[PDB]
């Protein structure tokens, strides 16, 4: 599979004319192709540690880069929203957080925060033994007993412990919580969920966030609750 540079996603931090005709294609991993950046692109164009694809692939193949608590030795590994990126020989820890200008940026985060990931619940399924499988925004799954799975609804958020494989906390989608827009145009805006128009399709409901007097609107699919008035994890 190839990725022509013209068909590369528009938000990617690469030049559109100066360069080759190809771009590094993400390797079908734990995100969306159009909402993720390959690890080699992160190493070469986002952190500037490697000057070529060869040097970036060397750095990745040594195992110096860790994504969400797991060493990633594939240079095409997708990196997406809220992922924790950890550099081993340097000790620097970033979170892939929504950004107003670059649309997705690596912001440094504390080491205590590096083991948590805020994952937006994307759906629920019934699996064998009567258990509930929660599907999150990046394709991750969690199988839980039916009673705990009953009270978690779609579009909720869970702060999830990567190291324990557990749900550290659950943040339900209620009016007045703090939410961040993770998608289109109004990206990166943090504000209070204060207004909803419930369309017939729940994913397409109109949501309005407020930051003092700053009112932005999106659809319900494009927001993620990151807690009450103070965000649980450092996003900015």
């Amino acid at each position: 599979v190839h990725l022509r540079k013209s068909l590369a996603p528009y938000w990617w931090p690469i030049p559109r004319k100066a360069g080759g005709v190809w771009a590094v294609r993400p390797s079908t991993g734990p995100h969306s192709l159009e909402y993720s950046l390959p690890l080699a692109v992160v190493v070469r164009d986002v952190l500037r540690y490697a000057k070529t694809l060869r040097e970036a692939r060397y750095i990745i193949s040594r195992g110096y880069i860790k994504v969400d608590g797991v060493v990633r030795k594939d240079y095409k590994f997708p990196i997406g929203l809220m992922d924790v990126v950890e550099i081993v020989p340097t000790g620097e820890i970033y979170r892939v957080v929504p950004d107003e200008a670059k649309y997705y940026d690596l912001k440094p985060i504390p080491s205590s925060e590096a083991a948590l990931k805020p994952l937006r619940v994307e759906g629920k399924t019934a699996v064998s033994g009567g258990r509930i499988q929660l599907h999150f925004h990046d394709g991750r799954n969690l199988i839980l007993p039916p009673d705990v799975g009953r009270q978690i609804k779609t579009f909720d958020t869970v702060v999830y412990d990567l190291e324990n494989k557990a749900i550290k906390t659950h943040l339900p989608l209620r009016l007045g919580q703090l939410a961040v827009v993770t998608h289109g145009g109004n990206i990166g805006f943090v504000g209070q969920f204060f207004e909803v128009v419930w369309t017939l399709k729940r994913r397409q409901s109109v949501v309005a966030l407020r930051k003092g007097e700053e009112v932005r609107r999106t659809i319900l699919d494009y927001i993620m609750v990151i807690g009450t008035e103070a965000p649980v994890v450092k996003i900015s």
């Binding site: 009016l175 209070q192 204060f194 207004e195 909803v196 128009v197 419930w198 369309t199 017939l200 399709k201």
Partner: protein, 144 residues
């Protein structure tokens, strides 16, 4: 196959035909179209069968009812021509599936919902007449 009712039932109740088969009026997911005043046993019906419709509806007018369980409806809209700064009224005839419980005539205005393909030319089904539409509004909640 079809039984009429003196009053229109609701989404959910079960009515047993003279054959003894019980038909439960299914929720089609459209809250602003009332179920018909008759119940059929058709397994391709969206009200009394397993047929599933999408959220694409259209207002059409019935032109020809002579095929069995189908009709020819006309679709009308307006197209803008920029060079003349003027409009043109366009139309296109469509073939749709009319269930047994929903009796239609030429000139009638009905609603059609898109489904999976049922024949060579039919992929829309009559969900109800225009008199079966009720008013519907979204939920509007704000934080003071």
């Amino acid at each position: 196959t079809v039984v009429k009712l003196q009053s229109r039932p609701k989404v959910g109740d079960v009515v047993t035909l003279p054959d003894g088969k019980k038909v439960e009026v299914k929720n089609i997911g459209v809250p602003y179209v009332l179920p018909p005043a008759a119940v059929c046993d058709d397994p391709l019906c969206p009200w009394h069968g397993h047929l599933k419709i999408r959220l694409k509806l259209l207002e059409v007018t019935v032109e020809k009812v002579r095929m069995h369980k189908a009709a020819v409806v006309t679709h009308e809209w307006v197209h803008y021509l920029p060079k003349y700064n003027r409009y043109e009224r366009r139309r296109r005839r469509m073939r749709v599936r009319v269930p047994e419980c929903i009796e239609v005539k030429p000139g009638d205005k009905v609603i059609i919902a898109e489904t999976r393909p049922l024949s060579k030319t039919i992929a829309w089904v009559v969900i109800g007449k225009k008199e079966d539409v009720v008013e519907w509004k979204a939920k509007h909640e704000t934080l003071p």
